[PDB]
Amino acid sequence: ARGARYKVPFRRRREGVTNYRKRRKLLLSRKPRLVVRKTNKHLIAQIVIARPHGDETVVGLDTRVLSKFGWKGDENNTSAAYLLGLIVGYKARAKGIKEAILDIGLHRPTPGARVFAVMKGVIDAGVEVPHGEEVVPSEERIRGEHVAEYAKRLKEEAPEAYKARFSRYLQRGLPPEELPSHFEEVKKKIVEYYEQKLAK
Amino acid sequence: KTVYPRYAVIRLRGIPTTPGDIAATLDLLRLRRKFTMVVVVGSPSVMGMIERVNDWVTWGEIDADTLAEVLRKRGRIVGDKPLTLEYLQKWGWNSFEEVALAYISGEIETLACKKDFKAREGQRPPCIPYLKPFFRLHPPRGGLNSVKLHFSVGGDLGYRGPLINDLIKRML
């Protein structure tokens, strides 16, 4: 900036995307990283191997892939996070990845957060990810029961607020109170699609 | 492929008080006594050595006729025996002139055969077998100008060009 003695930080640091102190500790593992990132509308899950010239992404997907299995819930809620991990987990397993280490970047590791839901989905597909037993969200939250309970209360309190806060839910034809039923349907379709693929 | 020019190098200064790095290089160039002379192929690695010993030797491009005379008068084989026309003919070289021209022109890349060279049958060797790889010269008739000054400012050391042949004829 001002003068020759000014040291400009790393590009990814001044963009505010990479914590290089935490990234160094991840690379010391020499294991593939499960990279999970949150956007306003979608979630991103990637399985990455680090190489000296740049990282290599074995499998990468965002939550747009859920439309390929007829998902009608929101794009990036707890239920969508779990389904994304399942798809990534099976795809990663098909490529030979057995174990991964969770990499959440700048997000906070709050218990029950969506990053640990993606981890839970990845674990259930056979990819082992070390973790503590008090951060995975409860199965009710993964099934969307917290979404359905909220909408049911909204409808009987302010029926109009139900219409606005879930307008896109009504457009897709899936009312929020029926999310747990649909989540099982989508989860079954994903699991069956890949166990058969693995079998063949 | 590339044929480097062939140079004659003469040691002009003596052994005692010679600096250590210069003395080591002279030994590797086979100039281990004063007024000893060698012919080398001027590859870049060799020219780096001559630059190191520039203040102790004089050198220049040797001509085939001068080399022919040097071989006939100061060429020695194993046992410190004279090099004779008959010995050359036994090995397939017709004359002193032909082998000298073969070396100067680049047809052969070495004048004296190496230590581990093995002579075949019928095949003319690409060198002179058992020739000693150095020549012991006479002091120059009529003297030098100065063994302490460079040839470029009126002395005798360093690069001399084709005038090395005039000096060699006086030292034969």
Binding site: K7, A50, P52 | -
Partner: protein, 98 residues
């Protein structure tokens, strides 16, 4: 007064960095995987001095003998004596020259 011999005793110049190298170094040196027989160059990183080898090994070429956890066991020479340097990759660079 005689020379003092602390582990880092004449290392002001060696351990100094120019302004443009201030701060953390890049992580690519962490990601090279060395196998036995590889040639490495010991290039001390001053931001990790506690794991760095002695100043006498800066710029020397060694051969990787094996691994010890996360460090590499490197066989090198100081003059004529064989030395074993065990160090982490942040103080190593691949030797491309053979």
């Amino acid at each position: 007064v005689k020379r003092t011999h602390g582990y880092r005793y004449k290392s002001r110049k060696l351990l100094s960095k120019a302004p443009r190298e201030r701060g953390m170094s890049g992580l690519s040196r962490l990601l090279y995987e060395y196998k036995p027989g590889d040639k490495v160059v010991i290039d001390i990183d001053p931001t990790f001095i506690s794991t760095a080898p002695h100043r006498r090994y800066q710029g020397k070429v060694g051969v990787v003998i094996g691994t010890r956890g996360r460090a590499y066991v490197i066989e090198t020479y100081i003059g004529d004596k064989k030395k074993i340097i065990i160090t982490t990759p942040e103080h190593l660079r691949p030797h491309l020259g053979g």
